[PDB]
Amino acid sequence: MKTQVAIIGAGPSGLLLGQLLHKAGIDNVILERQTPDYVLGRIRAGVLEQGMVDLLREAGVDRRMARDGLVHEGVEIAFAGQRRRIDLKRLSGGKTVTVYGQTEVTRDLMEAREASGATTVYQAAEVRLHDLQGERPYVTFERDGERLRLDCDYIAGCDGFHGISSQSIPAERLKVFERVYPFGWLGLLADTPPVSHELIYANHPRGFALCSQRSATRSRYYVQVPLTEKVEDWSDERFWTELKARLPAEVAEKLVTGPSLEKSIAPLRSFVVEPMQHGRLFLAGDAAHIVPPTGAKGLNLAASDVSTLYRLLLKAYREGRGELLERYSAICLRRIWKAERFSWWMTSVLHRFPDTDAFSQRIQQTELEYYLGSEAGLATIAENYVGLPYE
Numbered sequence: 001m002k003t004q005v006a007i008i009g010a011g012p013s014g015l016l017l018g019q020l021l022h023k024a025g026i027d028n029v030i031l032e033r034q035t036p037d038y039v040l041g042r043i044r045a046g047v048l049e050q051g052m053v054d055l056l057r058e059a060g061v062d063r064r065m066a067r068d069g070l071v072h073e074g075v076e077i078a079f080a081g082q083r084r085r086i087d088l089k090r091l092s093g094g095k096t097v098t099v100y101g102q103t104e105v106t107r108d109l110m111e112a113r114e115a116s117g118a119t120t121v122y123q124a125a126e127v128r129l130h131d132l133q134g135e136r137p138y139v140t141f142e143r144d145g146e147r148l149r150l151d152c153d154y155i156a157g158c159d160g161f162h163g164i165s166s167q168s169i170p171a172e173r174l175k176v177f178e179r180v181y182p183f184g185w186l187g188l189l190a191d192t193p194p195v196s197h198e199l200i201y202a203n204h205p206r207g208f209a210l211c212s213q214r215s216a217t218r219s220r221y222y223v224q225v226p227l228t229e230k231v232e233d234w235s236d237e238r239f240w241t242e243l244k245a246r247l248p249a250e251v252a253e254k255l256v257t258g259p260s261l262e263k264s265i266a267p268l269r270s271f272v273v274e275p276m277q278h279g280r281l282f283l284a285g286d287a288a289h290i291v292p293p294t295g296a297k298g299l300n301l302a303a304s305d306v307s308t309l310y311r312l313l314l315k316a317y318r319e320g321r322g323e324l325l326e327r328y329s330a331i332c333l334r335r336i337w338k339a340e341r342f343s344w345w346m347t348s349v350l351h352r353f354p355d356t357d358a359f360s361q362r363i364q365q366t367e368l369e370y371y372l373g374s375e376a377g378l379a380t381i382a383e384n385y386v387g388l389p390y391e
């Protein structure tokens with residue numbers, strides 16, 4: 001087996017990169033450890049930046065999104081008995097965000113790929129990368145007990161947070177930046193109409209709550225919980241009661257509840273690795289960095305990493321300008337750090353932290369009061385939320 005670009009992982013990063021490359025005539029093979037079904041079971045993201053939307057259109061997979069996607073022009077933040085709407089369109093200069101689930105985006109990409117006939121190997125076990133610094137790197141894996149070898153020119157590590165790619169860069173070459181938060185998000189997906197046309201982020205004394213959606217008849221809700229919690233200790237009944245407790249009364253009373261389709265706990269963390277490449281290997285998406293969900297940037301950062309990698313591979317293959325690939329990490333890290341700073345800020349002003357003194361509580365409240373009450377303050381939230389420009 002030989003291909004031009006080997007891609008590890010068939011989550012949205014690998015699929016999006018594989019689609020863009022296939023359409024430009026660059027052959028690629030995607031290797032995925034799990035089954036299509038398993039990948040399709042991950043709920044995750046709900047909010048997309050315009051840059052991700054345009055990239056899906058460029059990859060030719062935007063029909064259903066254009067049809068089913070909900071374009072949002074504002075978001076709301078509730079705190080201390082107040083509800084403040086941030087007009088994203090006005091304050092960002094016409095930009096907006098699109099609500100379309102990650103499950104959907106993935107489904108759409110998996111379909112486009114199957115129809116194009118590009119190679120995809122699910123259940124590829126024991127993936128190992130070799131000769132990363134040579135001119136001929138290769139990937140080895142096993143399918144049906146047989147160990148196959150895949151020869152290629154470049155390898156894109158799009159295997160997420162628990163992937164094998166990042167582990168393949170010499171530890172003495174990497175710089176890891178990390179921060180773990182003392183809480184997670186308990187999410188509940190229900191077949192009910194959302195309580196609001198726009199999202200509502202809520203800072204409440206009992207802890208954070210978020211009212212999101214997937215469509216007009218499908219909702220996604222979250223509440224902040226301690227890392228010590230087990231999803232089995234949270235019945236649907238218990239979740240709805242807690243959620244109602246953390247929302248403004250007028251919002252809590254319009255809430256249509258119902259049984260859950262999905263329920264899980266996602267712990268929060270920030271994680272950056274530098275550089276994002278080694279020899280013929282380039283990391284993308286969660287494989288290289290993690291942001292807490294508060295700012296809705298994870299999938300959106302994978303999109304810009306992929307857009308950057310794709311464009312640099314085009315130059316190398318099409319224009320014989322392979323030296324440009326050395327700039328991969330520099331370009332990506334600039335956008336990554338700004339998104340990390342925003343996700344960190346959002347997380348710190350909206351959540352309840354354990355062991356927090358009186359001065360800090362007061363400062364947290366004042367941050368919200370200032371930023372939501374100043375025209376310049378609102379613009380900083382909005383321009384960051386819709387997403388900063390791609391380089």
Ligand SMILES: Cc1cc2nc3c(=O)[nH]c(=O)nc-3n(C[C@H](O)[C@H](O)[C@H](O)COP(=O)(O)OP(=O)(O)OC[C@H]3O[C@@H](n4cnc5c(N)ncnc54)[C@H](O)[C@@H]3O)c2cc1C
Nearest residue numbers: 009011013033044045046047159160285286296298299300
């Ligand atoms: C609760 C929550 C809410 C979120 N909300 C948002 C949102 O609203 N907006 C937003 O932008 N982001 C959000 N995100 C983040 C977003 O879900 C992720 O950043 C995105 O899933 C990452 O895409 P990826 O392709 O890099 O990785 P993944 O989705 O993790 O896929 C990586 C793939 O690699 C495969 N793999 C793993 N190891 C191997 C191996 N050894 N060999 C082969 N394959 C392997 C995996 O099975 C997986 O299929 C949210 C995340 C969560 C958890």
